Amino acid sequence: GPVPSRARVYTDVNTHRPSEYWDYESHVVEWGNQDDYQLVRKLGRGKYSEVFEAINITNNEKVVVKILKPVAAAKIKREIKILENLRGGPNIITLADIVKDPVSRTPALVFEHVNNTDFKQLYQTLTDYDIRFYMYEILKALDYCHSMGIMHRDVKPHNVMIDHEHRKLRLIDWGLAEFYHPGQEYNVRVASRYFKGPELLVDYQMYDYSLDMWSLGCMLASMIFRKEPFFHGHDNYDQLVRIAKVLGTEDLYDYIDKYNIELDPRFNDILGRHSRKRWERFVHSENQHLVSPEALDFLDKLLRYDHQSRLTAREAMEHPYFYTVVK
Numbered sequence: 642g643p644v645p646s647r648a649r650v651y652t653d654v655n656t657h658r659p660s661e662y663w664d665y666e667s668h669v670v671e672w673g674n675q676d677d678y679q680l681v682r683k684l685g686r687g688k689y690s691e692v693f694e695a696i697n698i699t700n701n702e703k704v705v706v707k708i709l710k711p712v713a714a715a716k717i718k719r720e721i722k723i724l725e726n727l728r729g730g731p732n733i734i735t736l737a738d739i740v741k742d743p744v745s746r747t748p749a750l751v752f753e754h755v756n757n758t759d760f761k762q763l764y765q766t767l768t769d770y771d772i773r774f775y776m777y778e779i780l781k782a783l784d785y786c787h788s789m790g791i792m793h794r795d796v797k798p799h800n801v802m803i804d805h806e807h808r809k810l811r812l813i814d815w816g817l818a819e820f821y822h823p824g825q826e827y828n829v830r831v832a833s834r835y836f837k838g839p840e841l842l843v844d845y846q847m848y849d850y851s852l853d854m855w856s857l858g859c860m861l862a863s864m865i866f867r868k869e870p871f872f873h874g875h876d877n878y879d880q881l882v883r884i885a886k887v888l889g890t891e892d893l894y895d896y897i898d899k900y901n902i903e904l905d906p907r908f909n910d911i912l913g914r915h916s917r918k919r920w921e922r923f924v925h926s927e928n929q930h931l932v933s934p935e936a937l938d939f940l941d942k943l944l945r946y947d948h949q950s951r952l953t954a955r956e957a958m959e960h961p962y963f964y965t966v967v968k
């Protein structure tokens with residue numbers, strides 16, 4: 642069977658905390674009043690939730706209302722507990738209220754309003770300095786949630802809200818977030834296809850906070866090389882092939898050997914043989930200004946098959962790539 646794995650940082654944060662911190666099913670929801678809010682317009686509808694721009698009539702302030710679909714309403718206590726535990730933390734979205742929808746029974750989460758929408762809208766037009774600046778801001782949020790014993794598990798450009806005018810950033814959508822418990826086997830059906838770590842693609846369930854660091858590495862490669870997404874898989878199997886064409890097959894097989902990971906037999910005839918490519922191969926005249934030896938060294942230390950070898954959020958913050966950022 643597979644060889645066990647544990648996080649190399651914040652390993653036992655939840656073992657010491659009182660049961661109330663991580664036992665989300667025991668949490669008692671003190672519901673608010675739905676009538677205090679007026680919906681203005683639908684911002685979007687996904688497979689699990691619906692988001693609206695709204696106004697709190699009790700104080701004239703602008704809010705964001707997220708209504709849960711009945712199918713995704715099962716783990717609402719988990720998302721509430723995580724949001725309350727992280728409230729006030731650096732670059733973390735603030736939960737202001739929890740109400741029930743008027744027509745349907747389903748819970749609705751109320752948040753602070755954040756200007757300029759999606760990270761994806763701006764992340765392909767940033768200067769070198771701005772990529773460095775915003776990467777440091779995301780790292781503050783990830784080190785904070787990891788230090789609090791929580792994995793985000795859905796890091797991607799659509800989940801980062803940036804107010805470019807005020808040089809402000811917020812990490813949103815904590816619907817897939819989970820408490821890290823050493824030795825626990827988690828569900829591998831998390832994160833968006835292009836941002837899934839190799840541990841999810843090979844069905845290795847004993848993963849940790851380092852999953853978020855692979856997703857962050859995917860975001861960095863897309864920004865500095867102007868290629869969105871960087872790893873463009875057709876499905877979950879082709880996603881691993883796309884990765885293998887860059888990182889090579891030798892390091893992939895060394896990874897499955899280290900943790901005694903059983904590979905799906907459908908990978909035998911699609912993986913092939915590939916050597917580790919130099920990051921300089923993705924450099925061209927149109928993206929050369931966004932690339933530096935520091936950027937390539939940093940990217941190389943994030944995008945590693947072995948989840949235990951990747952830089953942690955705190956080590957990433959120490960990298961020379963961030964020396965030019967004003968602190």
Ligand SMILES: Nc1ncnc2c1ncn2[C@@H]1O[C@H](COP(=O)(O)OP(=O)(O)OP(=O)(O)O)[C@@H](O)[C@H]1O
Pocket residue numbers: 684685686687692705734752753754755756758759799800802813814
């Ligand atoms: N707290 C917030 N403040 C301001 N805008 C928000 C907030 N939360 C979500 N939005 C906006 O609401 C819109 C609807 O988001 P929606 O959840 O439908 O997309 P998504 O789920 O992020 O995309 P994906 O399906 O890739 O996850 C988004 O464009 C997003 O920018």
Ligand SMILES: O=C(OCC1CCN(CCNS(=O)(=O)c2ccccc2)CC1)c1c[nH]c2ccccc12
Pocket residue numbers: 675676677678679680686689690691706708709710711740741742743744745746747749
């Ligand atoms: O005007 C209001 O609600 C109008 C609508 C009442 C009906 N609901 C539909 C909920 N049905 S649902 O099946 O839960 C659903 C469907 C799609 C996506 C997510 C969830 C949409 C909003 C509200 C006024 N204050 C609120 C506070 C929370 C939620 C809604 C409101």
